[PDB]
């Protein structure tokens, strides 16, 4: 049945591994359990005599499998039942020969692909790079030996260690997914698959996978997600073993990883579940191996020794002491000898042994220990921190409101200094906050800050799972597993228990009425609140009302109070990190009072941070904000609710073990529970705690008389203690003063965090003069330290759970390959690695598919070549162009796809039939609505992605029962038709502009409805509800299921297998933007009528320029050919790219790229774009007023004066490693025309070619390197069109608008 | 007779209005800083009262001095 | 005889004790404030829960449940 | 003949007042300085020396036992 | 003039009469009552001798009986705190400022670790190769915690 082929079972692990789920399907089948589960608390307590008398398909498969496995193992001995991770070394080396043959079928075809196409992939990479680096380099053009080993071994993916088990686990994974899908539909088919591997049998069901070994008479059982975990880890460590062995600066890691894997697997058999404590230490060794390379002897070798002592101290509790010695010696040998980058690389080994099995009991003990614990804080240190808290609020409100203090209760200003500073309304310095802390801690405030409860609205449209109330709490568990007296208490879920849905069905939702759940203390009257804790290793299940007040308080702190503390958000979390690490001693060592400043760094480890807060410590800090908002009791709700409530750890398969647990107010502080949780919950109330920690960091900076540039997101505190030194001072004095200041500050920071109740450790934290850690990225000496091998472990072979989607699965691989090229790998390696992996992807989906056609085109090898190499805009699968390797996706996509097809034809990869069939392709549907909603595009015939279809369907289903007073004008009866009519009005003119019409409709209220609809949380459990309450249909769902087939056949029909005798007038030797404009015009021609769709295309940055490195004599053969329009790129000679930074030219931060309601800004954006596009006359202003009238409530005489200038206004992932891009000089003088979009890309192209000159095996430079990117002799130099103004023919649509909504309208006339 | 009592009078009046008036502004400023060091006693006791969850309805818009005088 | 400028310097000298005895009753009144304020504090600290061995000044979680049965009050 | 009686009453008045005011105004100073020294001992034993206990329920007893 | 000055002088010295006789018996009694009211605050703040590890985390418990400043702790939380006091009245804190029911928990090197770390320092830091071979050669000869430390401070100085 087709209903059960949409929400597919997932292919990769995105869930915790629960132990007692697996033990339920172990006890439910007939097998004997392991020895470490004999006295278990859930196994001994349940009434299995009723549980085994249901005879659902959930149990009968397990009964037949318990009969089936038991036959191929004898009765002569005892059957050992090894439980994960004690079975890691076996399943690590699993060898099914069947799946090995089934993948070597694919291997043979990939070897055919290399034998047919390897030399044109050589010709491409040796022609494009030759073109961009000129004929002064055409004797220095040799391919990298990452590409060459990829070329001689095409089957890299098949001929490594771990491959023979990677085959096996991918095969068992796809079989179990197919068995789940086939078990969805009610049937009585063969629900069992037996495979045969070297010494034993493998049993596959919807739930379990059971692997047996017959010579040792053992067997292991795996739950549904545990085979996902093994399947992820095998291709993870095998792809690590591929990348770290074919890359020249990484081959020395290849043994060092293959040791440390195969070592710790051997430690799995006896350590067991505790071996992940050894896995959790593997990060600290990669830190300490960077810390071994300090400039001075201090701080070098401290944390490496600490982790080595901790590794010994954990192994000696379990091992013989000789084995702990030998193992510790081995670990210390592996992590020594490594460079800076090669010790950043060993952070890949984190997920590479998998995840420990979880349970509610042992994860509730670790919360009762540190949350129901007594504390004793210092009141006189609370006052010293609260001094800086109130002082920072005073200075933030002063700087925000033009030099005015907040509304102080004026009878509470004590002392002659603070009354003086109020009377002047000046800025408190930190010294006065330290000295006068008794006077400044007691200052009060009045209601001077007016909040806004629903500020963001994206955080209310999240799908956060909501606990059902405490009279129904046993509905959190499987009703199969509750006992009979506890089955009497579960009621039915009328709600969906989602914050996404129950917010939209919320009749009578007023924000200010709902904050009175807190300020009036009714939330603590409320005897229905139950909180539920998650199984993890940050999330909790609250009730509805309490979660709403949680999100509101987060929003109010996040917008009003938190930016007072400087906020220490995409590039501002890496400009304020890369320039912060310019403050190390080694970044500025050419030069080596008040002329230079340097820093040293502390990245700290606070023990159990979020749950060591108490009401006693945060009450006064909350009090200073309840006063500043005019609120009686708002921001201390967390501790006062958790003191009076009892919460538990939430897992279905982990019920309470005692069968006499009915009510939460009677359970003991025991098995799964926490009674009177004094501490916080991670993630919740994060803003207030971050602000208290900033106040404490600044307090300790003042108590040792130093300056600190901290950054903290919780307990991820990174402190840069600075010191300003002389240019003519000795280096030993500099590195002495820094270490003295670091010791003083660290001592005081220990001291001020100890007295508020927070252990930051002396040894666990990482002090260094050189590097620091932020979001698991190590910043060291003004560069970011490489993470290629973390990204290689995420390189996988299925991406998506909504259909058998090959297009999104090739897009995932394309992005991860581009990410490896950013971390520093060659271009020719990564592009051809993308080609080979998209080949493996498209053959992997033909076989192994869990939806049983494709046999026509799947053996056509030049079709599969031309399919994963043609860009996805033109129809194929290659999202990764050759240009995306050099720069970022700014610019027009269509010209780039045609430039790639022009290059692929010019070298001989892609056939000359295929470009001409693109140029002769029949058009698609074509809409004014679609061309407005998606410019840059083509009107080729295409099928819609199941992600887009199902997301849009869920957005339309959830806003059906939308009944809250807020966001009431979001879903109307004709919100489609206004978009259609507005697109028809904007677009159909004398000169069609798609981009500016996209800008206008995005600015008007139609795009506002789109933007607010696009904030809902489309998880899969939301898509399941929106399909179970309004089904997708018959034709759309058949387009969902057969999406990859229809896409592949559509590329085959339209552009590959096609004749197209009426070839057009456009040639193939022209500039590609001509062909993109021809294809846009011819494609939209049944809709446009013949008018030029213009104002879209940009040049391709690679195609435009013909670069040239200068020779020795100076002056280029391109600039001696009669050309002076170029860009000047200079690189100074003799740059050591390593620790010895003595004589480097000045390293700088490299090139990266009011006071109104934003409705008014969107309105003025609409007016500006409309007037600059269609001319400036009062007929245009008549409609532009009507469009801006939709958002705001101003009149025509304000728009003509408030209209901005006619403009171009229509960590996580760093853009690269920065090695020579901090040392390169840019001069855009001679390109007299393009001094916008073109030069922003030409700069990044030049700075990517410069660092593409030097690999990761080169630490020095030897010449000055100059580039002249000449572009006057180019085919793509075309004159900008003459803007001939006209008048918008017709009248704008009515654009009806509700005035009640603050999210969509601004009634105040500005 | 009148001149001797007159000069004894002015000697007594002169030196004692030297030293009493010398003594007064000193003790005046000390009773001043007793005020601003006794006000923060009530302020810190109002801070200490509201940390206990037995007093959570003591709404924050009130005065910490007034919570010291709350009883 | 003439005792004129002697009386004039007496008129000069009485202004010092004028301003200082003018300041005297304000100091006396502020001693009256400090007495009552210190009395309020020694009334308060006798009923706070400073810990001794014996532990009779304990509050439970029932005080949080009992006191939070109302809209929060204003003491100022 | 009247100013004699006037200054005779006057000198004993002025001296009696200001002599019975000197020997109070100076012990006033030493006593108030002793009292400023006295209150700083409460400025430390109440302010600096003060620690805040929360008897966290690190035991096994139900919430209805903790609601007692 | 005699009379016009004598009237104002008599009036102002009567102002001084009204100063003194009201100033003395009131202000001196009020500051005696003020001192008897501050001493009763001083005598109601029962110290308890908190015995933190702080950062100096040495053994020999009596040292933390020695370095232990007294503190008047204030119960600001529900429940019974009595299993965290001592016969004698002293409360020992954790590193997380947690009281502990028995204060013996506060006070609770090898040679392979130190050799491993100094080998990592020699192999990993920038160094001439023969000097690295020399310091590795005179490191397997070492036999105590001392003189590995000599190599450690010899390697970090080149």
Author numbering:
A (entry chain A): 8 to 544, 553 to 583, 588 to 611, 629 to 888, 894 to 1194, 1209 to 1265, 1278 to 1302, 1310 to 1384
B (entry chain C): 236 to 306
C (entry chain D): 236 to 311
D (entry chain B): 234 to 301
E (entry chain E): 236 to 343, 350 to 399
Sentences from the paper on this structure:
Within the structure of this complex, we identified the OD (259-302) and XD (302-399) regions of the P proteins. Based on these findings, we built a more intact four-helix bundle of P-OD into the model of Lc-Pe.
The L protein consists of the N-terminal RNA-dependent RNA polymerase domain (RdRp), polyribonucleotidyl transferase domain (PRNTase), the connector domain (CD), the methyltransferase domain (MT), and C-terminal domain (CTD).
